[PDB]
Amino acid sequence: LTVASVLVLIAATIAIIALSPKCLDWWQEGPMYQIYPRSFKDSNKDGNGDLKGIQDKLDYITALNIKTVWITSFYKSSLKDFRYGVEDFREVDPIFGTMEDFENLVAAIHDKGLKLIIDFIPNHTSDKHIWFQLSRTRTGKYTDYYIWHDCTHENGKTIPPNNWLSVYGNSSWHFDEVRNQCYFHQFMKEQPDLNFRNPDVQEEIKEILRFWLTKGVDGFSLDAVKFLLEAKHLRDEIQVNKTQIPDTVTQYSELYHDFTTTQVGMHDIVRSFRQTMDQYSTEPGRYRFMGTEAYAESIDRTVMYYGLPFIQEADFPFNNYLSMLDTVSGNSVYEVITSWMENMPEGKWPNWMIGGPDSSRLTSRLGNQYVNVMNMLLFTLPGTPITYYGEEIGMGNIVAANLNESYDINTLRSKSPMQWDNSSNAGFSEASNTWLPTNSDYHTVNVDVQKTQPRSALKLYQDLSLLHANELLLNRGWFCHLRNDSHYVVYTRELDGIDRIFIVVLNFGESTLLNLHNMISGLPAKMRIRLSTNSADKGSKVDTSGIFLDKGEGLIFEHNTKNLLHRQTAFRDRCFVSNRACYSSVLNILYTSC
Amino acid sequence: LTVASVLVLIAATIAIIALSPKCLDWWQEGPMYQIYPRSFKDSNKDGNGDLKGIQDKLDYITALNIKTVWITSFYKSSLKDFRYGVEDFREVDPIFGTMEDFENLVAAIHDKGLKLIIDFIPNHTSDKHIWFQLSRTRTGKYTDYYIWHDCTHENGKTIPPNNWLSVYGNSSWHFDEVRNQCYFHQFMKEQPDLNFRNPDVQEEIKEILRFWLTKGVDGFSLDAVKFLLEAKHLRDEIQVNKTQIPDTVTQYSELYHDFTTTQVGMHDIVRSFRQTMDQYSTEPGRYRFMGTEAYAESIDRTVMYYGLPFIQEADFPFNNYLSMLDTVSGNSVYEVITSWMENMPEGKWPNWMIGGPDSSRLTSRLGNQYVNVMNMLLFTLPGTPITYYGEEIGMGNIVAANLNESYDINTLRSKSPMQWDNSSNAGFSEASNTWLPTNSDYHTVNVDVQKTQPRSALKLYQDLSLLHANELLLNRGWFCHLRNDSHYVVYTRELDGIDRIFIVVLNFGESTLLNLHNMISGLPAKMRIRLSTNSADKGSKVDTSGIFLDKGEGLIFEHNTKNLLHRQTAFRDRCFVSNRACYSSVLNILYTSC
């Protein structure tokens, strides 16, 4: 009998190994906390943030159950704004420390189990770059590193070869008196676009990627992908106003950009970036993440960066939606969620971010009442929640100050220093005359004040990430949304074998009442609030038929049943999942077939 | 001692297996002989060629050392010309036999060691197709199988949504009175373009590919790849003449086609076609070939179909060059060869074809004197030589006849029936009033006459394919061309370890004399002609300094030396190879490292 029982065990183990799904990578589980390196924490007492200040506050990052950091671009740049025109990719600016300060930051990050991500701008460079200074003199192989074209430039003004306009001004062809030819920049006067059609240039970007990968940056995040390649035929773009007179079109909005955005072969360059990073992802635990971050485009063009089922391009493109939305309601939020889940290919991992560097703050664009409900929506979605720095608490925008450095007046309100304490400059730096004035109402909004008091908008961010990390329904579960309303958004998170669902209700309306008996069938007489926007109500009792919800109010309901909505014939076109799996309570393991 | 000698043998075998390069596939070695199914051979005595007639003449195909057939598109088509508008992809027309006649043809081909290739047109369909007849009525899923757009069509004339013109006429948007909407065809009034943005349509093409792959067609050959996808924004194309008045542009030449050719995502559809055929290529000997056949475009766009080093797209695109060349000289032929070898990525397999269906005959475009020299150029190049039907001998064009069927007046001169015998209709068919009049001078030009007489332009095609198949220098060897001349084209074929080179000299001039001592160094006082255009110098003696060459004269010199040009520092930018390998005379095996 034992001789049969010994193989029945080996057959059981080989079945578990064959039925166990692939474990979620570090970029799939755990939220991200995007950090601005200049407005997070200062250590050397100079006025600007540094990489050492992020290492000192590393314990606070783990306190929020954060997995990845995604530090914003920190390079030796002559232009700190406008897509971060870099003049030296291998070196770091005098600010943010030195190369040794960066090596100690990534090492301390790996000791606490965290992951790092750095921004990468392969599209353009700076005017002070060693490649551009050698290109104007036609020195060696660098003579064709940029898009150069012969243009006429007489006594008074320059004439571009075409009407191609830059995103931040006029005349995206500028003339220089050294090379006597116009160069294509498309972003700014001091940001020449790096010609990617040169095989030498495409290989030079590989050396920059491998340089940081050996340091252990644990992935990249491309900035401008759709501006890589342009049309070889320097033809004029189609104007939006056909009757418009020429010599007047100077705005990037009044022009159809069909020859300077998303050209043939642009994705193949993105496909080659993943192939280079794949050489460093051979380790079982050391996987490399790659983000495209293509903003200001339609939904069908964003989902193209996910790749094809037979060729890998990128893990996921950064979800620009939910950030440009100024006025939120039941229909605007529902349209954004369905636009991403319906256009994304199946088996991919979505993502969501409420705010970012080039966007207004949450409480300044939506309001202080929507800070709690938007944080729950970020953690109750199947995608990877991405959080901006200072977004876990309610940090308002600041007025535009006149800085001597070349910085964008707009989109600078989000670069305010992090409010740590209630001391001078909100504890961001012990020095005076900081690079940006700290927000005025910092004595009432800071990490130290919100930690000591209950019912604050800091504990809600803590237990949401804890609920997202501990519970398996939020990590890898189905997403079944319930129709469309203008005063409430309700969706259900479920998984096979759990015998328990999560009902998330977000108001986004005007203090209306919800009847849960009209949306989901089979709910009992009473249901418990697992997580309330106002902590004073967690673990309370509310009946389904009639729920009092305020403006900025959101609830999470935990119901025990084996009546998952994803199994019913009605909820088949409104249920999405990335990794279909079945849970087993008896044998605590993940199953594919069930 | 023996205990050490036994492992020294195993170490030798495991070294040979590890150093042996990959064997050349069936599409890399052996020439192709493209056959027109309607003008090759008739069996049922009806007037038109059939697939059974190709089976009867299969022994002649093997007599030319031909590896692949590449039968031109033979489907149930309502339009036999203009890119072969098909109305039924799963069935065959009444002509060319039935489905059983095709199954007996592919089976007889595999018995003689030959390979088959069929043409595939996934771009468009016919008006009588079951998909188009079901699309005009909006019946089920077929309502979006074609590019439909709402257009105005009042009493007198239709108005297209844009100025997009077809390749064969005006107004590539036509109106139908059933669906009351304009459909996009881009080729002809009865050739609606199949909308590929529909996930259903892209999957329906997979079922057509798998249908023929189970029959054993041994690969496909796509017809129109650059016309698959179009721009979703129905914007007007840029006119070549800016001052041109609208309502007059009706020619495909006077318009820049930037929104209807080579769109973003077109290659991804081609990448998916190879992924479907890869499921049938798992066998070691049963490999599937895929050709793109993108004509009328630049060289940088044609080499993009070769694929990337990390994703396979196609084996090789069909080389449209060397066919549009009407007047041949030393510079026109040299530019074509260098344009393909310099733009093609390394490790790929090139190709060459002198003529085709949509091109004039060789002796009618170049002359009867250039028939012999162009056949040698096809077999002395590293690519896969592709030969049109009737091209091995000198077959002239015919005058344009008025046929009752919808056929193109031009490009029909190449569809003349094959001249087999000197009987009625040149032995093509025993019936009268054939579909196309056989060329008049068939009593002097036929396969039977050229076989019995020596010094004909049929034996030169036989021993060239024999020399290309037997000798390894022509199969997989280096290609080092010697500078540029206007009265002779000289290149050298060599391989490491052979200790012997092949010097090919083609005149393409006006009966000039060549001094071989000025081009290649190290040649002896006398050299032998392995293969000559005029089959009389085969084994003669000619000194290097001074060689008498006529207008249509070509020579192959076989020199024994270990001074290969590809090893010298001067001939490094003019030497190309696909599979770099080293030969060993002692051990008759192929080596990678040497």
Ligand SMILES: *[C@@H]1O[C@H](CO)[C@@H](O)[C@H](O)[C@H]1NC(C)=O
């Ligand atoms: C165009 O050039 C002029 C001259 O500097 C400048 O004042 C103007 O701001 C430019 N247009 C835009 C939109 O920046």
Ligand SMILES: *[C@@H]1O[C@H](CO)[C@@H](O)[C@H](O)[C@H]1NC(C)=O
């Ligand atoms: C822009 O379009 C409008 C037509 O609606 C008209 O003002 C004109 O065609 C254009 N404006 C100017 C100043 O030309």
Ligand SMILES: *[C@@H]1O[C@H](CO)[C@@H](O)[C@H](O)[C@H]1NC(C)=O
């Ligand atoms: C800062 O916080 C501490 C404790 O919360 C408090 O005692 C102190 O009065 C505060 N100082 C200012 C300037 O707000």
Ligand SMILES: *[C@@H]1O[C@H](CO)[C@@H](O)[C@H](O)[C@H]1NC(C)=O
């Ligand atoms: C739901 O969506 C449709 C179209 O988007 C809209 O017409 C309808 O008013 C919406 N229903 C509610 C309750 O908002």
Ligand SMILES: *[C@@H]1O[C@H](CO)[C@@H](O)[C@H](O)[C@H]1NC(C)=O
């Ligand atoms: C345009 O339409 C007219 C009407 O049939 C036709 O005669 C003409 O041939 C068309 N143009 C071309 C280039 O075919």
Ligand SMILES: *[C@@H]1O[C@H](CO)[C@@H](O)[C@H](O)[C@H]1NC(C)=O
């Ligand atoms: C085409 O271009 C030429 C200018 O070279 C001129 O004839 C005109 O602009 C165009 N022709 C017509 C008939 O409009």
Ligand SMILES: *[C@@H]1O[C@H](CO)[C@@H](O)[C@H](O)[C@H]1NC(C)=O
């Ligand atoms: C055809 O060929 C045979 C042998 O070559 C010859 O005897 C006969 O006279 C020829 N007939 C015609 C009509 O050319």
Ligand SMILES: *[C@@H]1O[C@H](CO)[C@@H](O)[C@H](O)[C@H]1NC(C)=O
């Ligand atoms: C070779 O090519 C160059 C440019 O294509 C041309 O100027 C030159 O005349 C050519 N030399 C000969 C002998 O044809």
Ligand SMILES: [Ca+2]
């Ligand atoms: Ca660029």
Ligand SMILES: [Ca+2]
């Ligand atoms: Ca099409």
